Design goal:
A ten-stranded mixed sheet has the order 4-13-12-11-10-9-8-5-6-7. The chain has 513 residues and is of the alpha/beta class. 25% of the residues lie in helices and 25% in strands. It has three domains: 11-93, Recoverin, domain 1 (Orthogonal Bundle), CATH 1.10.238.10; 94-382, Alpha-Beta Barrel (TIM Barrel); 383-513, Immunoglobulin-like. The structure holds D-MYO-inositol-4,5-bisphosphate and calcium ion (2 copies). Residues 113, 142, 144, 191 line the site of one calcium ion. One of its GO terms (molecular function) is GTPase activating protein binding. Ca(2+) 2 binds at residue 1. Its EC number is 3.1.4.11. It comes from Rattus norvegicus.
């Protein structure tokens, strides 16, 4: 009984079967079989006794089997729940890409009106908001500066009733957290509304507070392109207008001069200097993407574009970043304080590359001479269809999505493909009523994706309500190239992007060309 219970509360058939199938009849998995599993199933490339051994060394609970270079079912399970059994590639969870190209070549995690904790009209601002962002990996932050009492510049939403905070205070927080999450450059987007006096003050605080972190002079060399995240490692750069504007400030804008969108210079040689940056609202961006997809892309190859939520999003709601990333846009600004699929995809995207905040664009988005246009797809390197088959097997300890009572969850799972439009798909499972502890669905979906290099796969679990909406329970977004194959567990996240210790989905992923 009491064993039978812990034994029976804790008894997952899917796992048994999986171990069975792997080990065949043996009560154990020999390296020879482990490796077969690692290869045939988990489709690992580095599959080999080396891997298999580290797996066992790392996960095998039995001192015997461990010592005897073997894996018992338990050890199998643990691996499966480990950072190694995770659907989101462990390898990709550390900086592993080329940090040498000019910034324009990377997608940069960017925040919008960062100082805000809520809505854009009357919610509050706080330095906490910049801390959070920074802790969530954000590299590019926004400071809307306005003159304040006692000659001290303040930051708040120009023309609204949003609460205020000090320019200096913000500067310290940034100073303190700019690199907690990553060594790479942080970009400060100044939106100056300050009298010349207070402007200078600003300039003082910057120098005073950022000190040496501040990048106040062009990098020796750095002549034809933007520096690389490597070159700027440890610095913070300013972005704003460059010569109503005191030189103290303007003299600090080195590689990020705000500019009004000129146009894309294919019908010429140049347009915006690599050191010039344009911003575009959601709407405009779409339009240009709709009309000049290839223009933009090519543009974005050597220039940084910043996009920002549409004016009507007074609720700090966000738009989808994918659409812009698809155009090579790199400083895709979102309202970091707002839970939703948009931040889910955003943060999923940036978990890649050890979440350093910079993610190398695919090559075809880094070739000045590119005919790509996610909107008018033609054959190109980017064109590389794959067939994804995802099996939603079971759920484990799905969290009680609050609810002001003792009810049980009634879960269902949605899997979605995000990328070029042609590739967008969504599918959902059935609801298992009244089970969150160990719902088992065993449902499989299949998707065709022509442009994996821009895709992301999202797993979301809602608690079904016949009556009401459908309570979000947890979610997880994995970029296509970090999607791991075989049996894996998807570690679910709360709406706020926090890790849910024991909430997981157990799945079988298979990708074939
Ligand atoms: O920092 P930029 O690139 O200028 O973009 C900002 C944007 O991120 C946000 O403040 C919008 O509310 C605002 O309308 C816009 O400024 P705007 O008044 O120039 O449109
Ligand atoms: Ca702003
Ligand atoms: Ca129920």
């Amino acid at each position: 009984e009491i064993e039978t219970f812990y034994k029976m509360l804790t008894q997952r058939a899917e796992i048994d079967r999986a171990f069975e199938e792997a080990a065949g009849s043996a009560e154990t998995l020999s390296v020879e079989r482990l490796v077969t599993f690692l290869q045939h199933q988990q489709r690992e490339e580095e599959a080999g006794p080396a891997l298999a051994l580290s797996l066992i060394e790392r996960y095998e609970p039995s001192e015997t089997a461990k010592a005897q270079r073997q894996m018992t079912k338990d050890g199998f399970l643990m691996y499966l729940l480990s950072a190694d059994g995770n659907a989101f590639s462990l390898a990709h969870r550390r900086v592993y890409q080329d940090m040498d190209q000019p910034l324009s070549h990377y997608l940069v995690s960017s925040s919008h009106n960062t100082y805000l904790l809520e809505d854009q009209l009357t919610g509050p601002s706080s330095t906490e908001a910049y801390i959070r962002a920074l802790c969530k990996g954000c590299r590019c932050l926004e400071l809307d500066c306005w003159d304040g009492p006692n000659q001290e510049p303040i930051i708040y939403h120009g023309y609204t009733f949003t609460s205020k905070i000090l320019f200096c205070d913000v500067l310290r927080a940034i100073r303190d957290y700019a690199f907690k999450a990553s060594p790479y450059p942080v970009i400060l987007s100044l939106e100056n509304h300050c009298s010349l006096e207070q402007q200078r003050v600003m300039a003082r605080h910057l120098r005073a507070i950022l000190g040496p972190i501040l990048l106040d002079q062009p990098l020796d060399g750095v002549t034809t392109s933007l520096p690389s995240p490597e070159q700027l490692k440890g610095k913070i750069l300013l972005k704003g207008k460059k010569l109503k504007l005191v030189p103290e400030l303007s003299d600090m804008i080195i590689y990020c001069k705000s500019v009004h969108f000129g146009g894309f210079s294919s019908p010429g040689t140049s347009g915006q200097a690599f050191y010039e940056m344009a911003s575009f609202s959601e709407s405009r961006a779409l339009r240009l993407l709709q009309e000049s997809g290839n223009g933009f892309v090519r543009h974005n190859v050597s220039c940084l574009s910043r996009i920002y939520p549409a004016g009507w999003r007074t609720d700090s709601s966000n738009y989808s970043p994918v659409e812009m990333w698809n155009g090579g846009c790199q400083i895709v600004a979102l309202n970091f304080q707002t839970p939703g699929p948009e931040m889910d995809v955003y943060l999923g995207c940036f978990q890649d590359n050890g979440g350093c905040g910079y993610v190398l664009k695919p090559a075809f988005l880094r070739d000045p001479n590119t005919t790509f246009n996610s909107r008018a797809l033609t054959q190109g390197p980017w064109w590389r269809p794959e067939r994804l088959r995802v099996r939603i097997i079971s759920g484990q300890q799905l969290p009680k999505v609050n609810k002001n009572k003792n009810s049980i969850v009634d879960p269902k799972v949605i899997v979605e493909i995000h990328g070029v439009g042609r590739d967008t798909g969504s599918r959902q499972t059935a609801v298992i009523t009244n089970n969150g502890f160990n719902p088992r669905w065993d449902m499989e979906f299949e998707f065709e994706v022509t442009v994996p290099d821009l895709a992301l796969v999202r797993f979301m679990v809602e608690d079904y309500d016949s009556s009401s909406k459908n309570d979000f329970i947890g979610q997880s977004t994995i970029p296509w190239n970090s999607l791991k194959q075989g049996y894996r567990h998807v570690h679910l996240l709360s709406k706020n992007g926090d890790q849910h210790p024991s909430a997981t989905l157990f799945v079988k992923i298979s990708i074939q060309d």
